[PDB]
């Protein structure tokens, strides 16, 4: 099916505590494979997936220098942005950068995207045409003017349409065993008495990959999304994910309710009934 | 790989 590779950059300034802290991670559709921390002892790009280990020392050495430069690049960006918003040097601010490229079942290019944020709000983003920038506020025009004059959009588009998909396809082939396989959700249902007049019914989805999944309760075919406790999908730590959904039931109306699980690893949407 | 373009903002 479809696949993607995304990188997440985080630069947090430490006024007085020292120099800005920089962290970088990269993923393959849900699976992290690289790591970098400016405060770590190694000061190197480290492996986080088994299939990236085979890359030679040349790959690690240059990728370390690539990401190290970005930390320096962000360091001056903290000072530059602090000027745009007329902020004081003692405040701690953060710069977050999100970029990646999307491929298809045939491996051909689908979409590229690059987004930058300042203090949890959108700052500037590359539009889907890979030729123009979207500025969020007044200070974002200033970066937009500088980036337009520097032909930054042309430089970024070359990576997304080019080297990004070239290495994305290389990673998938190297990790066919783990990245291209889907684990269907292992489902089960549980019963909790909340009182003598009512009870709690929870529908579980365990050990599935990828993260996209849909859990819904139905009362005789009628969705109960209003009286439903939904929890955010969570990682199990072994590369799989979890999700459970609860509903409050009358003490004798358990079998009237059904749970519907939708996941790409399952050929057909599973229906679970008491 | 890595493709963040750094142009100083």
């Amino acid at each position, epitope marked *: 099916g479809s696949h993607s590779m995304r990188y997440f950059y985080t630069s947090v300034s430490r006024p007085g505590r020292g120099e800005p802290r920089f962290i970088a991670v990269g993923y393959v559709d849900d699976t992290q494979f690289v790591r970098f921390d400016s405060d770590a002892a190694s000061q190197r790009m480290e492996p986080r997936a088994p299939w990236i280990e085979q890359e030679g020392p040349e790959y690690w050495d240059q990728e370390t220098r690539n990401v190290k430069a970005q930390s320096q*690049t962000d360091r001056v960006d903290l000072g530059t942005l602090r000027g745009y918003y007329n902020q004081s040097e003692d405040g701690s601010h953060t710069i977050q950068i999100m970029y990646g490229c999307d491929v298809g079942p045939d491996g051909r290019f689908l979409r590229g995207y690059r987004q930058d944020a300042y203090d949890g709000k959108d700052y500037i983003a590359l539009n889907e045409d890979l030729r123009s920038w979207t500025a969020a506020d007044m200070a974002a025009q200033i970066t937009k003017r500088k980036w337009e004059a520097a032909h930054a959009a042309e430089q970024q588009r070359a990576y997304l349409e080019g080297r990004c998909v070239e290495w994305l396809r290389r990673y998938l082939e190297n990790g066919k065993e783990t990245l291209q396989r889907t684990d269907p959700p292992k489902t089960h249902m549980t019963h909790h008495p909340i009182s003598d007049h009512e009870a709690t019914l929870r529908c579980w989805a365990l050990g599935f990959y990828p993260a996209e999944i849909t859990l819904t309760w139905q009362r005789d075919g009628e969705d109960q999304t209003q009286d439903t406790e939904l929890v955010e999908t969570r990682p199990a730590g072994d590369g799989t994910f979890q999700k459970w959904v609860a509903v409050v039931v009358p003490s004798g109306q358990e079998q009237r309710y059904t749970c519907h699980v939708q996941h790409e690893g399952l050929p057909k949407p599973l229906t679970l009934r008491w | 790989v890595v493709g963040a373009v*750094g142009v100083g903002k």
Partner: T-cell receptor
Amino acid sequence: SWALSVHEGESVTVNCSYKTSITALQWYRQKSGKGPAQLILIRSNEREKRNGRLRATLDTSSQSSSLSITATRCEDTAVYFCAASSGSWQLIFGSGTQLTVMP
Amino acid sequence: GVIQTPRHKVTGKGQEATLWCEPISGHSAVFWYRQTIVQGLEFLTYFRNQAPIDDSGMPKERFSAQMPNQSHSTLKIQSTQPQDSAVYLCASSLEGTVEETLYFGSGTRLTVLE
């Protein structure tokens, strides 16, 4: 694969190859005595690009590029390098070819 | 353009050679290259906003590169040896990217004699 000789006025084509997956390729010439100077920049998402008398082509699949100079002059006698930048930080220069424009 | 001094320098083995480069004002990157053969160059070090980025080409010993301020850069060979003879080139690009136009200096021709 080291030197080229072409008479005045005729068109010159120079070839070079790179190994890394690149996002931009540039052509530089260094006149004997002075520092290198940039000629033209072509991006990986482009196939051909031209500036004045300089016409350059890029083949991503074959990892090679060609530079065409129309109506060559004696001033065009120099050594031509092609620089391949795989990212925004890496840049690798080629072996270079000596062009000699005969009068 | 880019200014390099000295244009030439002939010195005996064992001395200290200091190279000086003034990049074009406003540029946020400085590159150092040496060239032994008329063919391909050799990369030495690379700065951005006075902060080093890559020095994988610098010789491990006796070689030291500094950028005291935005407007000047120096390269120092502490113990000159005849194996260090080459043409040393200084280049500057704006916004610090290598995907941009590199403006080179005239270069320093250094010959160290035993």
